[PDB]
């Protein structure tokens, strides 16, 4: 027979008699039934999840708002037993099987806050005993539900202490678990769209936390095929926080710069993300310290034996040869943009040993990636005739089809090409810019087809910044087109 209201509301009352039963024992040390007596019933108190809709009744019979004083309690064995409770309740396909009754919830155990009652059982745990290590686990699985399904819950759940017990549990001196693995993708989901994580990451001094536990691997490979799950993760918190001009800073005095060069030098597995740190710590004009600081460590010569040849495949490596180039030139166009002084002087240079031996080999990109716009384009120009013969009218999600079909081909490195294509030749360099139209005059190719991109890599220039901003680049870009 299955469980109906009166089912429910005759289990909630139990656990209800037996919390506040068990609650009266103020007297020590003799309560070992009383207390597993509030075990086996928040057990058995597992199966509403089954029916999720009768979820209301948790609240309005003071379940929930018990449950969470249950999360305090002395003895640490009733305290995963909520905990448990707690994720078998929060599971997000259960969440989605009612509306009404998901909610109710949610919004009961935010109101009484459950993550930083949470944190504070979870600062107090050991996990030695699997029992415990699992409760922490459970802890964590909780979180991922709750933010999953309710991303703006992260930002008020963080600032109660996850974070700061996320980084203390990462940079804790323990062997590698699969719980230390779990904190690294929570700690990401935190991050993700989300400045006001970031801004308190920062704030909590955990750029460095993050940095110290990637050094690690500047040399070694990670043995584990969850380890470099991890070192990944690391890398897309650390990456996340980045895009925030706060943490270019705090980047700078951690000297993360002088580790990701330095993972750049070993050519471990850590080589391909940490070309992608370099890139997010250089970019735009909150990167210009790190250009500079970048150059000062001798960056140039990292960076430019990576710029004469991509890596060969690996296939442990995701990383595609494309996306490789795509940050070579990102980081080349942000020095060539951000760079003054002697450290710029420093970056022409390389444009102009061997013989210009940089230039051509930009103009062999050049020609690469324009071409595959080329052949891409001619493909979705041939669909579209297809498209009015078979009466398919066009319309936005084709265009957005299409626009991704232009991304994979290359449309942002190829920008980024004429970019430094014309900034290079703005150096008054006649070496390097009787180069450029040497090779182009010989290729068949026109100097019009890489103003034509200028313009529209200036037009497009700046999402999620200033108007002003906005458009003082893109008259700064396009002024590069005379003296070209």
Not at 63 to 79: F, I, K, P, Y
Not at 116 to 133: G, I, M, P
Not at 182 to 193: G, H, N, P, R
Not at 461 to 479: A, C, H, T, V, Y
Request: glycine fraction near 4%; proline fraction near 2%.
């Amino acid at each position: 027979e299955p469980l109906d209201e009166s089912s429910v509301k005759k289990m909630i009352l139990t656990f209800e008699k037996r919390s506040y039963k068990n609650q009266e024992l103020r007297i020590k040390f003799p309560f070992m039934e009383s207390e597993l007596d509030l075990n086996d019933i928040i057990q058995e108190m597992h199966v509403v999840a089954t029916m999720p809709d009768l979820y209301h009744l948790l609240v309005e019979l003071n379940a929930v708002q018990s449950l969470l004083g249950l999360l305090g309690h002395d003895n640490t064995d009733v305290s995963i037993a909520v905990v448990d409770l707690l994720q078998e309740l929060t599971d997000i396909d259960t969440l989605h099987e009612s509306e009404e009754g998901a909610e109710v919830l949610i919004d009961a155990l935010v109101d009484g806050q459950v993550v930083a009652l949470l944190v504070q059982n979870l600062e107090r745990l050991d996990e030695s005993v699997k029992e415990e290590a699992d409760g922490v686990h459970n802890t964590l699985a909780i979180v991922e539900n709750m933010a999953e399904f309710r991303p703006e819950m992260c930002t008020e759940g963080a600032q109660q202490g996850l974070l700061q017990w996320l980084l203390k549990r990462l940079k804790a001196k323990m062997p590698f678990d699969a719980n230390k693995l779990y904190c690294s993708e929570v700690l990401a989901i935190l991050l993700q769209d989300n400045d006001e994580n970031r801004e308190l990451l920062g704030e909590l001094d955990g750029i460095d936390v993050l940095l110290q536990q990637l050094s690690v691997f500047k040399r070694h490979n990670p043995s584990t095929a969850e380890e470099q799950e991890m070192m990944e993760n690391l890398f897309d918190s650390l990456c996340s926080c980045l895009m925030l001009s706060s943490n270019r800073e705090r980047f700078l005095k951690g000297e993360g710069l002088q580790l990701m060069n330095l993972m750049l030098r070993e050519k471990k597995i850590s080589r391909s993300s940490a070309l992608k740190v370099l890139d997010h710590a250089m970019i735009g004009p909150e990167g210009t310290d790190n250009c500079h600081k970048f150059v000062d460590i001798l960056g140039l010569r990292t960076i430019f034996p990576l710029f004469m040849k991509s890596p060969r495949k690996i296939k442990k490596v995701g990383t595609t040869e494309k996306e490789h180039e795509e940050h070579v030139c990102s980081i080349l166009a942000s020095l060539l943009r951000n760079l003054r002084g002697q450290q710029r002087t420093r970056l022409l240079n390389k444009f102009t040993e061997n013989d210009s031996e940089k230039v051509d080999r930009l103009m062999e990109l050049h020609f690469k990636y324009l071409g595959a716009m080329q052949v891409a384009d001619k493909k979705i120009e041939g669909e579209k005739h297809d498209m009015v013969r078979r009466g398919e009218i066009i319309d936005n999600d084709t265009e957005e089809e299409f626009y991704l079909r232009r991304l994979d081909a290359g449309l942002f490195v190829l920008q980024h090409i004429c970019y430094i294509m014309a900034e290079i030749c703005n150096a008054n360099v006649p070496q390097i810019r009787q180069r450029v139209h040497q090779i182009l005059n010989m290729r068949g190719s026109s100097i019009k087809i890489v103003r034509h991109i200028i313009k529209e890599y200036a037009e497009n220039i700046g999402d999620g910044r200033s108007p002003e901003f906005r458009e003082n680049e893109q008259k700064r870009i396009l002024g590069l087109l005379e003296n070209f």
